[PDB]
């Protein structure tokens, strides 16, 4: 197929909820070595979010049974082997995204916006790996730091990509680094800085930003429960 057909097939798959199809097309678009547009970029990201989120979801359930079947030797072995099966799938997916990013998406990022997006996505998928590992937590951090630098310099505090990064990076501190302090401050600041500048919101992103700010506070409220 051609770049324009793949994209329209990717939009069809998403409405069908057929996420592997939608990621196959968007991965094929990516591998054409030309930089991706905002729309293509969001489609690749939505695709692989759902593909990996299914495994992430299967992994959580089966790990919990695994823990609950302590004392039941036969059950616990069955749950462990299957967890391990879901993990292989999950790792292959994270490395699919991570290689795509490394080879195509990060080098060819010609704009600060892209660069922040792809770097946040790099340590998203290393965070997904951290969930399932280890000393690869650090690489989730370096991606996210290089993204959080480039974002604070170039972007308004109400930009959804910068707020969104505030939100993921914060969860990485809270969850992967076990550090609720470095998590809460990061999200209190992201939020407080966005709320002092609500006039910098634009009609194209005010729903995106305003949502993610709610999600920043939600986390902060929980992390004080």
């Amino acid at each position: 197929m051609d770049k324009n057909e793949l994209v329209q097939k990717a939009k069809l798959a998403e409405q069908a909820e057929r996420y592997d199809d939608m990621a196959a097309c968007m991965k094929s678009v990516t591998e054409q070595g030309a930089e991706l547009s905002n729309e293509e970029r969001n489609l690749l990201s939505v695709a692989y979010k759902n593909v990996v989120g299914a495994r992430r979801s299967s992994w959580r359930v089966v790990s919990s049974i695994e823990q609950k079947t302590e004392g039941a030797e036969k059950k616990q072995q069955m749950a462990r082997e299957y967890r391990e099966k879901i993990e292989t799938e999950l790792r292959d997916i994270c490395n699919d995204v991570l290689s795509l990013l490394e080879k195509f998406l990060i080098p060819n990022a010609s704009q600060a916006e892209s660069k922040v997006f792809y770097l946040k996505m790099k340590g998203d998928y290393y965070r997904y790996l951290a969930e399932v590992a280890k000393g690869i937590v650090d690489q989730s951090q370096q991606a996210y730091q290089e993204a959080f630098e480039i974002s604070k310099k170039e972007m308004q505090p109400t930009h959804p990509i910068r707020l969104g990064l505030a939100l993921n990076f914060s969860v990485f501190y809270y969850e992967i680094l076990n550090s609720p302090e470095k998590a809460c401050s990061l999200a209190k600041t992201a939020f407080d800085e966005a709320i002092a500048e609500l006039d910098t919101l634009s009609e194209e992103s005010y729903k995106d930003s305003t949502l993610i700010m709610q999600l920043l506070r939600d986390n902060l409220t929980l992390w004080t429960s």
């Binding site: 979010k49 989120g53 998203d124 997904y128 969104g164 939100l167 993921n168 969860v171 809270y174 969850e175 993610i212 999600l215 939600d218 986390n219 929980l222 992390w223």
Partner: peptide
């Protein structure tokens, strides 16, 4: 639980 950009 904790909200990310990557759930729901």
């Amino acid at each position: 639980a904790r909200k990310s950009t990557g759930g729901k």
